């Protein structure tokens, strides 16, 4: 009962809320729906937003906050006129930092410049950044690509963005969205400006915005059926220090020797927890920090104290090894290096062998019943797409069984120049990535 009692693979869902409550990410208020972000899922948070913060101001992107908002989006482009005039007024580069299943913490950037050139470019710098919050920090792959156009946001030229795919339930959530808005807002609020020409134009904008779906990504991708696993980087406890008794003598020997350890990795500012609770047994603690997704677990018992050593044990295989005392700072840090590199590629494997390059409609369900994606040659025509959706939906009788258009990813395999949309015969556009979604 107070380990996972839902395996990941049979019951998906019930595995996740027993993760995300005794791993101590979230605490539910009430039997509304509502719940706490706990230091174990706001330390995530923190780590990302110190990231995306110190990335975003390299592009002169500045932080502030705009208070005031309409069901939802922020009242912002009514101002901008107010803020520019002429081409030395831009680029205008703004980033909020927002606190409001229900999604609570969020970021929110907005900026305006005086072509399109540079709007773009800043809308592809900044999905790439998303791209690297996703692996460098919480270790998840994903697929940058563009949305169809029923799918991208309305007052968009087009929607950008990044997919993630849980491989267990063969389902695509979108991950981060960053939009080209062209002037759409710059003709409804009059935001001009005078060139370096004295000529009156039009801004260009963009949009982009993560939201804590995030955690819940990396969660859903890593986790397993011993509860969290926490990518180093995103964890405040990279290693719990593990003492074990054999009744037989010496505990303060076990005891010394544990806090050397201790003192090593927190002078090497690697923060660590040595769980010298007497109360309970060793085969307890160990369940009850892999629970909260501690990544590296040292054991220090008899043997350790006679051979000068400890053994190191990875979260994310349980992988075991001798250490000696002198080796456990650097052999630690790579440890740590080395378990966040697996997640990634582990991640990448999954997401790789979820994607099924089809050439006609014929392929498709094969793939569906298999809980993976397919990557098509598309016409890209609008009206398929509610097509798409209802026929896939039919041949499957299934929470929608419905296939949707996820991106049109960045990538594209070759295109043959005679190559027919996989659904309507007619001439294909472009290769884009279908699935069932969140
Ligand atoms: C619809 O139900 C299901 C029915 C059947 C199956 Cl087979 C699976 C599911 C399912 O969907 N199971 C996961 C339920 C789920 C997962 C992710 C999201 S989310 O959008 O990503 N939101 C967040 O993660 N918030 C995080 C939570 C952790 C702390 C920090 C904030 C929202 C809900
Ligand atoms: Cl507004």
Redesign the pocket.
């Known amino acids: 009962i107070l380990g996972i009692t839902s395996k990941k693979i049979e019951?998906?869902?019930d595995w996740?809320?027993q993760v995300?409550v005794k791993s101590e990410?979230?605490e539910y208020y009430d039997i509304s729906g509502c719940?706490i972000?706990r230091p174990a899922?706001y330390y995530?948070?923190e780590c990302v937003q110190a990231f995306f913060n110190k990335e975003i101001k390299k592009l002169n992107v500045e932080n502030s906050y705009f208070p005031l908002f309409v069901t939802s989006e922020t009242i912002m482009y009514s101002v901008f006129p107010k803020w520019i005039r002429s081409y030395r007024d831009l680029p205008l580069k703004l980033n909020q930092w927002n606190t409001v299943?229900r999604?609570?913490?969020w970021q929110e950037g907005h900026t305006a410049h005086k072509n399109e050139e540079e709007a773009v470019k800043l809308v592809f710098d900044i999905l790439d950044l998303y791209r690297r919050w996703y692996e460098e920090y919480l270790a998840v792959p994903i697929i940058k690509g563009i949305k169809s156009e029923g799918e991208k946001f309305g007052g968009a030229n087009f929607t950008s963005t990044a997919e993630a795919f849980i491989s267990?339930?063969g389902?695509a959530?979108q991950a981060a969205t960053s939009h080209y808005l062209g002037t759409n807002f710059a003709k409804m609020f009059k935001i001009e400006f005078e060139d370096e020409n004295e000529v009156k134009q039009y801004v260009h904008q963009t949009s982009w915005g993560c939201?804590?779906?995030?955690?819940?990504?990396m969660?859903?991708t890593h986790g397993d059926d011993k509860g969290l696993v926490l990518p180093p980087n995103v964890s405040k406890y990279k290693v719990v220090i593990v003492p074990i008794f054999y009744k037989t003598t010496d505990e303060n020997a076990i005891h010394s020797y544990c806090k050397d350890i201790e003192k090593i990795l927190k002078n090497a500012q690697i923060n660590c927890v040595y769980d010298d609770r007497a109360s309970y047994s060793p085969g307890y603690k160990f369940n009850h920090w892999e629970l909260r997704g501690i990544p590296i677990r040292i054991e220090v018992g008899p043997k350790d104290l006679q051979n000068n050593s400890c053994v190191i044990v990875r979260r994310d295989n349980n992988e075991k090894c001798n250490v000696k005392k002198e080796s456990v700072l650097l052999e630690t840090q790579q440890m740590l290096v080395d378990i966040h590199k697996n997640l990634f590629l582990k991640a990448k494997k999954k997401l790789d062998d979820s994607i099924v390059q089809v050439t006609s409609f014929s392929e498709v369900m094969n793939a569906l019943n298999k809980k993976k994606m397919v990557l098509a040659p598309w016409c890209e025509d609008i009206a398929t797409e509610e097509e798409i959706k209802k026929e896939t939906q039919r041949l499957s009788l299934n929470?929608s069984g419905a296939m949707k258009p996820l991106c049109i990813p960045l990538d594209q395999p070759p295109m043959p120049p005679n190559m027919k949309c996989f659904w309507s015969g007619k001439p294909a556009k472009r290769w884009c990535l279908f699935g069932r979604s969140?």
């Open positions: 019951n998906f869902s996740y809320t995300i990410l979230i719940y972000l899922a995530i948070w299943t999604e609570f913490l267990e339930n389902r959530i939201t804590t779906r995030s955690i819940g990504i969660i859903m929470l969140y």
